[PDB]
């Protein structure tokens, strides 16, 4: 019925429109067709009659229409720097002659004539940095390619007479480059692309600091001077190139305007486009300046910008209009039955050359005719003579002018390669009208493609090696892109000599980021999104012939019909094509600018290098005035700045202070070089913030909507997350108060309407049609909504028991509810849907919500992990969210506030409102790709998930695929929450199309500091206060400023904000917290506000991070890798993640036996019985340093202790190793004291323990994932000689020795090989062979130990694996560098902190040091003491019992403090949660004669 009434509404609206041939009419038609398609496909009432289906199909054939729009009379072309004008002018003239009323525009970037020199300088800087990095990562092997390259760079010498020689030498050197091993080539590609990205980011930060709103040539010159030592000769060369290009453009345009008139052809400046400076496009044009390997071609973004802005026809300056009927006919008549002239490229190219010369009144028979037989030469000559005899103005025909609304036809090209016909679309020719939707779709696709390209940098934990086993389809894969860039850099230019088939590298076309293939893909997706109007353009997952232009008939009973094309195209086969630009036409050598990079200013590139400041060289450029004025501030800043940079954790107090004072130094200093140095410091701080990441606690929280009809999606999500990981704790949160308030709202709304089941449906549709046929239509809808909201406001205002108490009972107290509804109603009657039919409605409401909850509970009653929580019981009394619940809050964002409040309370992990699913793993995608196509995976995944979870087989998937899916464990096919990382600022955020939304909130692990949570708490309190003030109707500037005078959220307090807030308050007082947020800040979501809040505490780095968002960089609060997908299209929520191609590797979990021994009380037995044996074995093979630091964190062998192993891989020197060792000892002691003895810890110790455990879990998952993957780490079987030659010859610093149940670490610390086993500690050796023999012997130590490692009664040589990598930055990329400071800082327990200070406190009339008071254990409101209590905290200081009893169990406590403790215990009390202890603090043991001797000796000394 809803579908029928929607049909009626849409027909009513569409027939009354000012112009049906527009966007909204097309949208209405599309949605009508879609819903009618559902209706026909819906067997709701049988299949009706074949006649009804016939009616439906005739109707859908009818309603399509055409809605044709004309095209603007404009022709566009893009001028490319260095293009000779004498070649372009011919095609300009031909297009002007063919199209009479069209206006030709030549688009020229006046401010980028020198961009080629700048880009080449950046490219060679990047290549030299990559070469240096690769050389330093492979010191054992001397790569001769690098030596040859450096030798060539040295022998460059003379510039003017050696540029061509240098280019040719590089051309030959590419052949030598194509000889190194494949991993080296991958290293070059990855490093080269990454270095370009970093250099572009450095240039953009230079633009940010300089405060420039436009990028022009002298800005590039200044940047080059500030980066490299740029001389005056180079600036002269740059300016000469700029002037030469300007003169060429001026000459060309002057000649053309003289011959045709200065009104038909003119010149446009691309900087007039409003899309270059648009924030969404984030300056991808500048990036394309650099990441471009088809130099002679124009840019791909500018075409789309031009077509969107002005519209019309875009053409390349290398193309001619298509021939007319007569020309083709005469060509056939002069060749008889030889169709080779119209199909072979060479012959038609010669014909095109001849016709082009003829039309422009040049020497007709001067055609090249190269490599053409004499007979064909003569035939072409007669053909050209016949054409020349034919009058002009009839040789070229015009393309179709009319066009469907919101579409972009694409030129189609047919070529006759030796292997057959190649038919592809080209971006060389387009048609569009001003502002069509497909242009916007293609632009969005280009932005997404550029974001995905910038993934090797923006993502810390990327992939370096892929094995390139299978690669096809879209392929944005960075490895191939880097390969093409290296090809372009070294081997001159592309297209050299021969290129695959007929000088056409199709692989290039499939690899182009924004080439024709991306446009085709986005057009296909747009047409699919159109609906039932779209399949006319869709032909079996490919674009049909209707989308393209210049389509020839496919059925010519042999070849094609070159007489009557379906649509008219253009003659893209042109003598000035790339076939001449490759060899014949002179290659552009003005685009290269040699620059030796031995003079690189390393200290001015914070993104590339990490520089620690000092007082010697940091001030070697400042002016004397600023010197000795701010030099001292920087000098005493160094000590904190260097330790902040060289740290594993982030101290937010230190960071706040450092950044605030750097910003202060900025604001009060007037200089340009010192400001640049301090900005470099700020950029280093920002990069440090971005590199740090903290784990997530493997918890998913789902806040479902209990009003959706379908409930299988939530069950599917819960089951998928249960199957993804055997430790993922699932929480489902709801709120009885929220739905109760929703029900009351609906009741009041229906009542206030009253103030104004087939039979009931028929009556309602009759009433709706009756009011649609008279004045009640289009006159009271907005009245209904305004009146209901105003009466909701008024009912909120009156505040009776129905409001404050909300009638939470509804058992007997429905009587006053009914009489109140009568009072609010204007019926002045009885039982008017109030005494009757209302109790039934209430019963329906409660039964629906409660049965949904009951089904959710019962379906997962056997799983202890799935917990159903009620929000009303978790929140505290009197909080913001509690007051929102109590007063009555029914806005759609109440769930967002609930997520924020619940995270503030303490529950961590992912928070989401919709039904997320774990992302498919790489194995699942590989299985799917073995039978399907990449574009089909997104549609076939729901069936695969159904079969994996519910075991529901489908007929749409081959049985072999189902068997393969059933073969693998479910947790090998889905990606769990565990292992995901977030920014150290705290809460992350999901994203779409670059922007960040509130669909998913991923919070950091518990224990780690979280500033965003506190900022959100304070800001939500402020928003609630503002809400209350607007509700009361008493708000003005004064009290608004006073209400926000103490909180951080006062940086939004501008005049316009005040005016907007007051106007909105006067318009509609009762508004939502998110709406108030939008009115106050101007940002759409709270997620966008958080960075602004943080910039109050980080005035320098906060603004820098915000300002880098619109320069291509991801938001600092965004998520890189998405392990979640949405359950309606299966698209990742990540910023630059594509789940289909970049799928995460499956992690092999480790499972132990259920009877696993060594509980927490019995684990020390293992060390107790094996430590001495381990020591003897270590001494029996030669070891000068043996140290024991056994762990008590992991009693069982789950994860085979791999997490701990990875921590020992984090260190690379002995000092950091010792720091990590002692910190792990402290954490194990804390864990033993907490869990084994059941003694509560202090807040600091508990947080440290939680952080260490979260890190251990995350590293365990990551290590298990890395072990079972071959591209990342090279697995090897046990072989002593192989391993020792691996360390000696190949060169490896770190390796993991993995057994079935354990993991050992082997490092080359300094010159001494350290073998670490988390049990028994580490042993040092002077040679790898000794370490390997000791490992094998240590395995064969005791049958208990051998069994405990899972090597009992099994061969050792075939069950121990060795894992390593080819270079150490592989390890640096895999291992996260935010390890909570365990490897750099010495973590002090609260007892050590209290012992450090010496200040006894006066408690109960006696003096007691704070350390001893803590050791006794003093609980303030159920929490240990961390600071010395003041005079107002003593009476409330209780005493802990268990801690005290343990304290007596440990120490002897001589009477001199035993009496003091007696006084403390009697004066104070014992907290009820602990147990009482009898006073038995005495000391009378032994004799104090040894005490006499000890004091005698100490006085002696």
Author numbering: 242 to 997, 1036 to 1780
From the paper:
Under these conditions, we observed conformation II and another, extended conformation (conformation III, ca. 40% of LifA at pH 8.0), which was absent at the tested lower pH values. Vice versa, conformation I had disappeared, which suggested that conformation I was a low-pH form and conformation III was a high-pH form. In conformation II it was close to the centre of LifA and in contact with the vertex domain and in conformation III the ART-domain was on the other side of the protease domain. The subdomain organisation of the C-terminal arm in conformation II was also maintained in conformation III. However, in conformation III the whole C-terminal arm rotated as a rigid body by 180° around linker L-IV placing the N-terminus of the S1-subdomain at the distal tip of the extended LifA. Concomitant with the reorientation of the C-terminal arm, the linker L-IV changed into an extended conformation and spanned the whole distance between the vertex domain and the distal end of LifA. In conformation III, the subdomains S2 and the C-terminus of S1 were adjacent to the protease domain. S1 formed several interactions with the N-terminal helix of the protease domain. One of these interactions was a π-cation interaction between H1448 and R2628. Such an interaction can only occur at high pH when the histidine is deprotonated and thus can contribute to the pH-dependent stabilisation of conformation III.
Lymphostatin is a key virulence factor of enteropathogenic and enterohaemorrhagic Escherichia coli, playing roles in bacterial colonisation of the gut and in the inhibition of lymphocyte proliferation and proinflammatory responses. Here, we describe the structure of lymphostatin from enteropathogenic E. coli O127:H6, determined by electron cryo-microscopy at different pH values. We observe three conformations of a highly complex molecule with two glycosyltransferase domains, one PaToxP-like protease domain, an ADP-ribosyltransferase domain, a vertex domain and a delivery domain. Long linkers hold these domains together and occlude the catalytic sites of the N-terminal glycosyltransferase and protease domains.
